[PDB]
């Protein structure tokens, strides 16, 4: 395990520039998106929660393609606002239900330090 807790205050610094293998060591799901929602990174813990294959989703659009249940004001709307302001930092519960048994999660979206990059962290609740 990487020794990092979900929700930690400086998570963006600890995860800055992490390679794919290190991201796979986290206790929680971690996705990195560009400002349009294209998937740049997707870790093993996320794939175990959602069923998606972390290798196959890279390059797909999270809102248009992988996760249409998040294409709503309550998820995508918050993402795109926080991308626009440059200070996205929001934590909220949500249910994932596309082509899967519904599962309720806690989501933490936070701007990454690297350019045009935004984290989406997920754990079960
Ligand atoms: C709703 O369509 C949610 C889908 C989903 C959420 C998170 C993922 O990592 C993959 C699919």
Would you give an account of this structure?
With 125 residues, the protein is of the alpha+beta class. The chain has one domain: Beta-Lactamase (2-Layer Sandwich). Helices cover 30% and strands 26% of the residues. It has helices at residues 11-14, 20-23, 44-50, 54-57, 62-66, 73-85; strands spanning 29-33, 39-42, 89-96, 103-111, 118-124. A five-stranded antiparallel β-sheet has the order 2-1-5-4-3. A hairpin with a 5-residue loop joins strand 1 (29-33) and strand 2 (39-42). The longest helix has 13 residues, at 73-85. The relative contact order is 0.21.
Structure, briefly:
This protein is an alpha+beta fold and 125 residues long.
Please compute the radius of gyration using only Cα atoms.
13 Å
Helix content: 25-40%
What class do helices, strands and sheet pairing give? Answer: alpha+beta
The tally of helices reads 6
The CATH architecture: 2-Layer Sandwich
**Any idea of the CATH topology?**
Beta-Lactamase
- Tell me the count of domains: 1
Order of helices and strands: HHEEHHHHEEE
> Would you state the CATH class?
Alpha Beta
Ligands present: 4'-hydroxycinnamic acid
Question: In CATH, what is the homologous superfamily?
Answer: PAS domain
Strand order of the largest sheet: 2-1-5-4-3
């Amino acid at each position: 395990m990487e020794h990092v807790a979900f929700g930690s205050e400086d998570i963006e610094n600890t995860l800055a520039k992490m390679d794919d293998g290190q991201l796979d060591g986290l206790a929680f799901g971690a996705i990195q998106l560009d400002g349009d929602g294209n998937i740049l990174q997707y870790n093993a813990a996320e794939g175990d929660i959602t069923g998606r294959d972390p290798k196959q989703v890279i390059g797909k659009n999270f809102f248009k393609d992988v996760a249409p249940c998040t294409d709503s004001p309550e998820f995508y709307g918050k993402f795109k606002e926080g991308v626009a302001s440059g200070n996205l930092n929001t934590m909220f519960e949500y249910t994932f239900d596309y082509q899967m048994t519904p599962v309720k999660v806690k989501v933490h979206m936070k701007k990454a330090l690297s350019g045009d990059s935004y984290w989406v962290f997920v754990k079960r609740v």
